């Protein structure tokens, strides 16, 4: 079966025929984080001389 | 001595810096930069012992 000859460790099921977890290649992720979660640099402690 | 912490090449007050004060007594102290290169939003700082 293709379930046991597909490379990259793919997985198939009774479904729209997806190919789950085919680990291959890389993904160009780009993310815009919320500005609220940022905290001013001047408030965080300085951890120099470590 | 004066140490820069994080400066942003921008228009808003993105530049921050920490000053290692070495004082003797306690009291108010005006702060100002005679040079026009940088402008300091902070006006008065109270001085503790070092």
Short mmCIF file of N, CA and C in Angstrom, two decimals:
data_model
loop_
_atom_site.label_atom_id
_atom_site.label_comp_id
_atom_site.label_asym_id
_atom_site.label_seq_id
_atom_site.Cartn_x
_atom_site.Cartn_y
_atom_site.Cartn_z
N UNK A 1 0.82 -1.23 0.00
CA UNK A 1 0.00 0.00 0.00
C UNK A 1 0.84 1.27 0.00
N UNK A 2 0.29 2.34 -0.59
CA UNK A 2 0.97 3.62 -0.54
C UNK A 2 1.21 4.08 0.89
N UNK A 3 0.42 3.57 1.83
CA UNK A 3 0.59 3.92 3.24
C UNK A 3 1.93 3.43 3.79
N UNK A 4 2.60 2.50 3.10
CA UNK A 4 3.86 1.94 3.57
C UNK A 4 4.98 2.05 2.54
N UNK A 5 4.82 2.86 1.49
CA UNK A 5 5.90 3.06 0.52
C UNK A 5 6.11 4.55 0.29
N UNK A 6 5.22 5.37 0.82
CA UNK A 6 5.36 6.81 0.67
C UNK A 6 6.57 7.29 1.47
N UNK A 7 7.52 7.99 0.84
CA UNK A 7 8.69 8.47 1.60
C UNK A 7 8.34 9.62 2.54
N UNK A 8 9.33 10.10 3.29
CA UNK A 8 9.17 11.20 4.24
C UNK A 8 8.16 10.88 5.34
N UNK A 9 7.87 9.60 5.54
CA UNK A 9 6.97 9.20 6.62
C UNK A 9 5.58 9.78 6.52
N UNK A 10 4.99 9.77 5.33
CA UNK A 10 3.64 10.28 5.15
C UNK A 10 2.62 9.35 5.81
N UNK A 11 1.38 9.83 5.91
CA UNK A 11 0.30 9.03 6.45
C UNK A 11 -0.99 9.38 5.72
N UNK A 12 -1.81 8.36 5.45
CA UNK A 12 -3.04 8.52 4.69
C UNK A 12 -4.17 7.86 5.46
N UNK A 13 -5.40 8.29 5.18
CA UNK A 13 -6.54 7.77 5.93
C UNK A 13 -7.81 7.89 5.10
N UNK A 14 -8.89 7.33 5.64
CA UNK A 14 -10.22 7.41 5.02
C UNK A 14 -10.72 8.84 5.16
N UNK A 15 -10.52 9.63 4.11
CA UNK A 15 -10.58 11.08 4.22
C UNK A 15 -10.65 11.69 2.82
N UNK A 16 -10.62 13.02 2.68
CA UNK A 16 -10.44 13.62 1.35
C UNK A 16 -9.11 13.23 0.69
N UNK A 17 -8.40 12.26 1.26
CA UNK A 17 -7.13 11.73 0.78
C UNK A 17 -5.98 12.67 1.09
N UNK A 18 -6.03 13.29 2.26
CA UNK A 18 -4.89 14.06 2.74
C UNK A 18 -3.68 13.15 2.91
N UNK A 19 -2.50 13.78 3.03
CA UNK A 19 -1.24 13.08 3.28
C UNK A 19 -0.64 13.71 4.53
N UNK A 20 -1.00 13.18 5.69
CA UNK A 20 -0.65 13.83 6.95
C UNK A 20 0.84 13.71 7.25
N UNK A 21 1.41 14.79 7.79
CA UNK A 21 2.75 14.78 8.38
C UNK A 21 3.83 14.36 7.38
N UNK A 22 3.69 14.78 6.13
CA UNK A 22 4.77 14.55 5.16
C UNK A 22 5.89 15.54 5.44
N UNK A 23 6.82 15.16 6.30
CA UNK A 23 7.90 16.07 6.71
C UNK A 23 8.87 16.24 5.55
N UNK A 24 8.77 17.35 4.84
CA UNK A 24 9.67 17.64 3.72
C UNK A 24 9.62 19.14 3.43
N UNK A 25 10.79 19.72 3.17
CA UNK A 25 10.86 21.12 2.77
C UNK A 25 10.77 22.08 3.94
N UNK A 26 10.62 23.36 3.60
CA UNK A 26 10.53 24.43 4.58
C UNK A 26 9.36 25.35 4.23
N UNK A 27 8.90 26.11 5.22
CA UNK A 27 7.73 26.96 5.08
C UNK A 27 8.13 28.40 5.32
N UNK A 28 7.87 29.33 4.39
CA UNK A 28 8.17 30.75 4.64
C UNK A 28 7.10 31.44 5.49
N UNK A 29 7.22 31.25 6.81
CA UNK A 29 6.28 31.85 7.76
C UNK A 29 6.58 33.33 7.95
N UNK A 30 5.55 34.16 7.85
CA UNK A 30 5.63 35.57 8.21
C UNK A 30 4.48 35.90 9.16
N UNK A 31 4.80 36.46 10.32
CA UNK A 31 3.82 36.70 11.38
C UNK A 31 3.89 38.14 11.86
N UNK A 32 2.73 38.77 12.03
CA UNK A 32 2.61 40.12 12.58
C UNK A 32 2.03 39.99 13.99
N UNK A 33 2.87 40.17 15.00
CA UNK A 33 2.41 40.04 16.38
C UNK A 33 1.62 41.27 16.80
N UNK A 34 0.74 41.17 17.80
CA UNK A 34 0.07 42.37 18.32
C UNK A 34 1.06 43.30 19.01
N UNK A 35 0.79 44.61 18.89
CA UNK A 35 1.66 45.59 19.53
C UNK A 35 1.41 45.70 21.03
N UNK A 36 0.25 45.25 21.51
CA UNK A 36 -0.07 45.38 22.93
C UNK A 36 0.87 44.56 23.80
N UNK A 37 1.25 43.36 23.34
CA UNK A 37 2.07 42.46 24.14
C UNK A 37 3.49 42.96 24.33
N UNK A 38 3.95 43.92 23.52
CA UNK A 38 5.27 44.51 23.71
C UNK A 38 5.35 45.35 24.99
N UNK A 39 6.54 45.38 25.59
CA UNK A 39 6.83 46.12 26.82
C UNK A 39 8.08 46.98 26.59
N UNK A 40 8.09 48.20 27.15
CA UNK A 40 9.17 49.14 26.84
C UNK A 40 10.54 48.59 27.27
N UNK A 41 11.54 48.79 26.42
CA UNK A 41 12.90 48.30 26.70
C UNK A 41 13.43 48.89 28.00
N UNK A 42 13.08 50.14 28.31
CA UNK A 42 13.60 50.82 29.49
C UNK A 42 13.06 50.25 30.80
N UNK A 43 12.02 49.43 30.75
CA UNK A 43 11.44 48.87 31.97
C UNK A 43 12.04 47.52 32.35
N UNK A 44 12.43 46.71 31.37
CA UNK A 44 13.02 45.42 31.66
C UNK A 44 14.39 45.58 32.33
N UNK A 45 14.77 44.65 33.21
CA UNK A 45 16.07 44.75 33.88
C UNK A 45 17.24 44.56 32.92
N UNK A 46 18.38 45.12 33.30
CA UNK A 46 19.63 44.93 32.58
C UNK A 46 20.38 43.75 33.19
N UNK A 47 20.82 42.83 32.34
CA UNK A 47 21.42 41.58 32.81
C UNK A 47 22.85 41.46 32.32
N UNK A 48 23.55 42.59 32.21
CA UNK A 48 24.93 42.58 31.73
C UNK A 48 25.84 41.88 32.74
N UNK A 49 27.11 41.75 32.37
CA UNK A 49 28.14 41.14 33.22
C UNK A 49 27.74 39.72 33.64
N UNK A 50 27.25 38.95 32.68
CA UNK A 50 26.85 37.57 32.94
C UNK A 50 27.96 36.62 32.52
N UNK B 1 29.45 57.64 34.63
CA UNK B 1 29.58 57.17 33.26
C UNK B 1 28.20 56.98 32.65
N UNK B 2 28.15 57.00 31.32
CA UNK B 2 26.90 56.90 30.58
C UNK B 2 26.93 55.68 29.67
N UNK B 3 25.86 54.90 29.68
CA UNK B 3 25.75 53.72 28.83
C UNK B 3 24.46 53.77 28.03
N UNK B 4 24.57 53.60 26.72
CA UNK B 4 23.38 53.51 25.88
C UNK B 4 22.72 52.16 26.10
N UNK B 5 21.39 52.15 26.08
CA UNK B 5 20.62 50.92 26.24
C UNK B 5 19.97 50.47 24.95
N UNK B 6 19.19 51.35 24.31
CA UNK B 6 18.57 51.03 23.03
C UNK B 6 18.15 52.33 22.37
N UNK B 7 18.75 52.63 21.22
CA UNK B 7 18.40 53.81 20.44
C UNK B 7 17.73 53.41 19.14
N UNK B 8 16.66 54.10 18.79
CA UNK B 8 15.96 53.88 17.54
C UNK B 8 16.18 55.08 16.63
N UNK B 9 16.64 54.82 15.41
CA UNK B 9 16.86 55.89 14.46
C UNK B 9 15.51 56.40 13.96
N UNK B 10 14.74 57.05 14.84
CA UNK B 10 13.36 57.41 14.53
C UNK B 10 13.09 58.84 15.00
N UNK B 11 11.81 59.22 14.95
CA UNK B 11 11.38 60.56 15.34
C UNK B 11 10.84 60.62 16.76
N UNK B 12 10.20 59.56 17.24
CA UNK B 12 9.71 59.54 18.61
C UNK B 12 10.85 59.23 19.58
N UNK B 13 10.56 59.31 20.88
CA UNK B 13 11.57 59.07 21.90
C UNK B 13 11.90 57.59 22.00
N UNK B 14 12.56 57.06 20.99
CA UNK B 14 12.95 55.66 21.01
C UNK B 14 14.28 55.40 21.66
N UNK B 15 15.07 56.45 21.87
CA UNK B 15 16.38 56.28 22.48
C UNK B 15 16.30 56.24 23.99
N UNK B 16 16.93 55.22 24.58
CA UNK B 16 17.01 55.10 26.03
C UNK B 16 18.46 54.83 26.41
N UNK B 17 18.80 55.19 27.65
CA UNK B 17 20.16 55.02 28.13
C UNK B 17 20.15 55.04 29.65
N UNK B 18 21.10 54.31 30.24
CA UNK B 18 21.25 54.27 31.69
C UNK B 18 22.53 54.98 32.09
N UNK B 19 22.44 55.81 33.13
CA UNK B 19 23.58 56.58 33.63
C UNK B 19 23.97 56.03 35.00
N UNK B 20 25.24 55.66 35.15
CA UNK B 20 25.75 55.16 36.42
C UNK B 20 26.14 56.36 37.28
N UNK B 21 25.18 56.88 38.03
CA UNK B 21 25.44 58.06 38.85
C UNK B 21 26.39 57.74 40.00
N UNK B 22 27.29 58.68 40.28
CA UNK B 22 28.20 58.59 41.43
C UNK B 22 28.06 59.89 42.21
N UNK B 23 27.07 59.93 43.10
CA UNK B 23 26.74 61.14 43.84
C UNK B 23 27.10 60.98 45.31
N UNK B 24 27.02 62.10 46.03
CA UNK B 24 27.28 62.12 47.47
C UNK B 24 26.02 62.39 48.27
N UNK B 25 25.32 63.48 47.99
CA UNK B 25 24.10 63.83 48.70
C UNK B 25 22.89 63.48 47.84
N UNK B 26 21.70 63.83 48.32
CA UNK B 26 20.46 63.53 47.63
C UNK B 26 19.72 64.82 47.32
N UNK B 27 19.17 64.92 46.12
CA UNK B 27 18.42 66.10 45.73
C UNK B 27 18.09 66.06 44.25
N UNK B 28 17.36 67.10 43.83
CA UNK B 28 16.97 67.20 42.43
C UNK B 28 18.17 67.57 41.57
N UNK B 29 18.08 67.23 40.29
CA UNK B 29 19.16 67.52 39.36
C UNK B 29 18.62 67.71 37.94
N UNK B 30 18.64 68.92 37.40
CA UNK B 30 18.21 69.11 36.01
C UNK B 30 19.15 68.40 35.05
N UNK B 31 18.58 67.93 33.94
CA UNK B 31 19.34 67.25 32.91
C UNK B 31 19.05 67.90 31.57
N UNK B 32 20.10 68.12 30.78
CA UNK B 32 19.95 68.80 29.50
C UNK B 32 21.18 68.51 28.65
N UNK B 33 20.96 68.41 27.34
CA UNK B 33 22.06 68.24 26.40
C UNK B 33 22.26 69.54 25.63
N UNK B 34 23.35 70.28 25.86
CA UNK B 34 23.55 71.52 25.09
C UNK B 34 23.60 71.29 23.59
N UNK B 35 24.15 70.17 23.15
CA UNK B 35 24.19 69.86 21.73
C UNK B 35 22.79 69.58 21.21
N UNK B 36 22.53 69.99 19.97
CA UNK B 36 21.25 69.74 19.34
C UNK B 36 21.10 68.37 18.71
N UNK B 37 22.11 67.51 18.86
CA UNK B 37 22.06 66.18 18.24
C UNK B 37 20.90 65.37 18.80
N UNK B 38 20.74 65.37 20.12
CA UNK B 38 19.69 64.59 20.77
C UNK B 38 18.87 65.51 21.67
N UNK B 39 17.60 65.16 21.85
CA UNK B 39 16.69 65.90 22.71
C UNK B 39 16.16 64.94 23.77
N UNK B 40 16.15 65.38 25.02
CA UNK B 40 15.80 64.53 26.15
C UNK B 40 14.42 64.95 26.66
N UNK B 41 13.47 64.03 26.61
CA UNK B 41 12.15 64.33 27.15
C UNK B 41 12.18 64.44 28.66
N UNK B 42 13.05 63.68 29.31
CA UNK B 42 13.16 63.73 30.77
C UNK B 42 13.69 65.09 31.19
N UNK B 43 13.14 65.63 32.28
CA UNK B 43 13.50 66.97 32.73
C UNK B 43 14.26 66.98 34.05
N UNK B 44 13.74 66.31 35.08
CA UNK B 44 14.36 66.32 36.40
C UNK B 44 14.53 64.89 36.89
N UNK B 45 15.65 64.63 37.55
CA UNK B 45 15.92 63.33 38.15
C UNK B 45 16.47 63.54 39.55
N UNK B 46 15.90 62.84 40.53
CA UNK B 46 16.44 62.86 41.88
C UNK B 46 17.61 61.89 41.98
N UNK B 47 18.63 62.29 42.73
CA UNK B 47 19.87 61.53 42.82
C UNK B 47 19.95 60.79 44.15
N UNK B 48 20.16 59.48 44.09
CA UNK B 48 20.44 58.68 45.27
C UNK B 48 21.95 58.52 45.42
N UNK B 49 22.38 57.76 46.42
CA UNK B 49 23.81 57.54 46.63
C UNK B 49 24.31 56.47 45.67
N UNK B 50 24.97 56.90 44.60
CA UNK B 50 25.56 55.99 43.61
C UNK B 50 24.49 55.07 43.02
#
